Structures are given as structure tokens and as C-alpha cells.
């Protein structure tokens, strides 16, 4: 994604439009409750197996635990992944908030263009030509700044997602 190829009107307008991070924040609270609930599930499951091992403690049951181990370790792995989701969603929301803040406001872009046309409309004798070129450099500076902000936004978001590893299928017990 090479946003430095798009002019500042595009990158600035794109980040300022939209509904904001609320739906992301609501999802972080939801994922976080799943983490809480499934940690309880993992704790209850381990306890269920240990009570059965206590109430008979014989070859019949000791073989059920062996056939249950792959699922138990899977359930542990799932708990670790669940605890990561909320953290990374909030890293993403922060990346968006910093991108929004560091992006050049559209008003600055519009004002540059508007001032440029006022010099054009008064440049019959050519004595504003250099100041026109200065305004063109400032616009290119805006272009570069928005390109840098989107670069850093992509990289922060890409790092956060890379830490959300794929869900794996649960093994069978019976």
C-alpha cells in the first residue's frame, strides 16, 4: 500500500471521514469478555478432569486423560490467543488516532491552493512567480507528510495484526 503516491487531498480526506473507532472499542470489550469467560471454561474443564481422576483413580480414567490431553493443551493455547485480541485492537485504535492527529488538515491544503490562485490572478507582471513556487513546495511538503503518516499507520496496524495468530481447530477427545 503506497499511499505516498496519492495527493494530500486523498490521504487527508480519507482519514477524517468515517464513523471513528467506536465499533472497534466495543469489539475490544467483547473480545475481553470472551477471554474472561473462556479462562473460566479452561479452569472448570481442568477441575472436572481432576475430580474424575480423584473419584476413581484407575486405568480406565487414566486413559481418558491421555485421550483428553491434546484438547487440554489446545484449550490452554486458545486462552493465550484470546488475551491478545483486546490488546491489539487498542494498539490499532491508537494508531488510527495518531494518524488522524498527524495528518494535514484539509483546510491547510485548501488554503494553500486558494492563496496560490490569488497570486496567479495578480501575476500579470510576474513578480509573484517565486512565491507561487514556494506555495507549490509547501503543497509537496503536505503530500510528503501525509505519505509518512500513512506509512507509519500501516506499519503499526500491520504489526498489531501479525500478533493475532490463526485460530486452530480443536482436536478430538473421544
Amino acid at each position: 500500500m503506497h499511499f505516498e503516491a496519492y495527493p494530500p487531498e486523498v490521504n487527508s480526506a480519507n482519514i477524517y471521514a468515517g464513523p471513528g473507532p467506536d465499533s472497534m472499542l466495543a469489539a475490544a470489550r467483547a473480545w475481553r469478555s470472551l477471554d474472561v469467560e473462556m479462562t473460566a471454561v479452561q479452569r472448570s474443564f481442568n477441575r472436572t478432569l481432576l475430580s474424575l481422576m480423584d473419584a476413581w483413580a484407575g486405568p480406565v480414567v487414566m486413559q481418558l486423560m491421555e485421550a483428553a490431553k491434546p484438547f487440554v493443551r489446545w484449550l490452554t493455547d486458545l486462552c493465550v490467543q484470546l488475551s491478545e485480541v483486546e490488546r491489539q485492537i487498542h494498539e490499532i485504535v491508537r494508531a488510527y488516532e495518531w494518524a488522524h492527529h498527524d495528518m494535514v488538515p484539509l483546510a491547510q491544503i485548501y488554503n494553500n491552493r486558494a492563496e496560490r490562485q490569488i497570486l496567479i490572478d495578480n501575476n500579470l507582471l510576474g513578480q509573484f512567480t517565486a512565491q507561487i513556487a514556494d506555495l507549490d513546495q509547501e503543497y509537496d511538503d503536505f503530500w510528503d507528510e501525509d505519505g509518512e503518516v500513512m506509512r507509519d499507520y500501516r506499519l503499526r496496524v500491520s504489526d498489531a495484526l501479525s500478533k493475532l495468530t490463526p485460530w486452530k481447530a480443536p482436536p478430538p477427545i473421544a
Binding site: 470489550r29 478432569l49 474424575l52 488510527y96 500513512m150 500501516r154
Partner: protein, 85 residues
């Protein structure tokens, strides 16, 4: 002892019900993520998180099946010893 197998089967099905209920309670929020802005980075993030939620729901449905097949085995194995008299 067959009564312990019956007790475990009852707790496994209770645990299964909790896994199923928590997945269903929060699914409206985890799958409703929208891009906070119109840029492509915001879209790639929201799209990833919606698909990540959807694949989690599949993973849990699969875990619910593993647990029910485990409770069934526990009950079937308990009726192999309670009548073996």
C-alpha cells in the same frame, strides 16, 4: 465406579453450554467492526478483525462438538459398568 462418569458428563455439558453462550453473547460486537476511516489501512484492520471473529465462532462450534462427543462417551461408558452386574 460409574456414577463419577455420569457426574463428569454432566459437568462437560455444562462447560460446553458456557462456551456456546459466551460466543453467542458477544458475536454481535466482534463481527460488527467497521473501519474508523475511509483509508485502506482502516479497512484492512476492520476486515481482519471481522474475519478473525468469524473464524473464532467456527473454532468454538467445533469445540462444542468435541465436548458433546466427550460427554456422550462418558455416559455410554458409565452405562457399560452400571448394568454390568
Amino acid at each position: 465406579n460409574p456414577e463419577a462418569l455420569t457426574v463428569a458428563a454432566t459437568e462437560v455439558r455444562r462447560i460446553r453450554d458456557r462456551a456456546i453462550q459466551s460466543d453467542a453473547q458477544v458475536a454481535p460486537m466482534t463481527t460488527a467492526v467497521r473501519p474508523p476511516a475511509a483509508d485502506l489501512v482502516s479497512e484492512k484492520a476492520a476486515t481482519f478483525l471481522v474475519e478473525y471473529a468469524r473464524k473464532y465462532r467456527q473454532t468454538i462450534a467445533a469445540a462444542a462438538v468435541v465436548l458433546e462427543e466427550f460427554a456422550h462417551a462418558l455416559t455410554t461408558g458409565a452405562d457399560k459398568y452400571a448394568t454390568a452386574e
